[PDB]
Amino acid sequence: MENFQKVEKIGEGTYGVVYKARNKLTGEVVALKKIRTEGVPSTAIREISLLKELNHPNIVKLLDVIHTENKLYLVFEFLHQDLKKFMDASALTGIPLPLIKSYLFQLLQGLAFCHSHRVLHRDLKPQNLLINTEGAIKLADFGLARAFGVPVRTYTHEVVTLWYRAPEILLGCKYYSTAVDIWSLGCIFAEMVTRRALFPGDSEIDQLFRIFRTLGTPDEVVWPGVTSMPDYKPSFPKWARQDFSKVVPPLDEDGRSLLSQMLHYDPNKRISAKAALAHPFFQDVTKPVPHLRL
């Protein structure tokens, strides 16, 4: 580095190493990501740069895009904990419903904001939802997938998780819609509630079949056009749909009704972030503070 003092290694991200660092001139504490081959594609630069203006309280702020020495670094606002770690830490008694509801509400506001500006995330997962001691939760890395794409493995060879991937993506659709993020968030919502991943697939077909086993194998009635998707095979086993009462017990009917709308197969029928914010589930939403030991 030069202007940033490295405090500690956060880990290996989907695009490269991430460090907690301190700006030597301002003293500001940030997350510094070194982006992975030769020359840095100008298109990515222009696209990522546009993200500097995508500002919202529930979106991790992109502070700077440094393109020097033909290297690429992204400087982000720093938060002390991610939802994956917080969930593992809450596995004992689970995250209280009021906090789950507050987090879901805030995440939907972030999605509504990005989606209104036509920006998609495409790879939402607990690891990129960040929280602070004030009860805020923020979405990290919106827009990077479009700028850099999503790898099978990270640079250290870790397998990028498929657990939150929408079915249209798994079936080969080339054009992603905002619906892909609602799906991922629905999966995360279900995981906060049950304390178990909803669809923990370990391959693309295992991921797809896990979805089919729970929500039923999609057909033309529920998803017009599904049998014409690039990777759809008429040989897919036909599983009957299970009851949500069995999928996320003991979530109440407001919660199950919202989840069901976030997991509709047809992207076009899937609830939008803005409409989800108006769902009765949020009638009694509050902003509790989590128990965070840093």
Ligand SMILES: COCCCNc1cc(NCc2cccnc2)c(C(N)=O)cc1[N+](=O)[O-]
């Ligand atoms: C390398 O990824 C592993 C997943 C966590 N990854 C991240 C976690 C963050 N914060 C929460 C946190 C968690 C643990 C320690 N210290 C801070 C931040 C950030 N912007 O503050 C960035 C990334 N990331 O850009 O990846």
